[PDB]
Amino acid sequence: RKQVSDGVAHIHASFNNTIVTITDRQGNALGWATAGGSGFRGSRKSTPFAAQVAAERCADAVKEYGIKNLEVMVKGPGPGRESTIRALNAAGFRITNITDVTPIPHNGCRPPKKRRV
RNA sequence: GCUUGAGUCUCGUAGAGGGGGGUAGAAUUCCAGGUGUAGCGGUGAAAUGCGUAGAGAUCUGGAGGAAUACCGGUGGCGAAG
Nearest to A29 by CA among A19, A17, A40, A15: A19
- The order of strands in the sheet holding A8-13 is A29-33, A18-23, A8-13, A69-75, A94-100
How do beta strands A8-13 and A29-33 pair?
Answer: unpaired
- Listed as ranges, the nucleotides of chain B within 7 A of a protein C-beta are 25-28, 33-36, 38-46, 55-60, 65-69
Beta bridge partners of A72: A9, A98
- Decide: helix, strand or coil at residue A71: strand
Q: Which CA distances in Å does A70 have to A21, A27, A53, A107?
A: 12, 15, 18, 33
The resolution of the experimental structure, rounded to one decimal in Å, is 3.3
Spatial distance from the CA of A42 to the C1' of B46 (Å):
9
Q: Are A54 and A91 in contact (CB under 8 A)?
A: no
Nearest to A38 by CA among A13, A14, A55, A23: A55
- What is d(CA A86, CA A90) in angstroms, rounded to the nearest whole number? 6
Q: Which sequence spans correspond to the domains of chain A?
A: 2-117
Spatial distance from the CA of A87 to the C1' of B11 (Å):
74
CA dihedral sign, ordered A12, A10, A106, A109: negative
Q: Which CA distances in Å does A1 have to A43, A46, A62, A64, A66?
A: 38, 34, 11, 8, 11
Spatial distance from the CA of A77 to the C1' of B26 (Å):
20
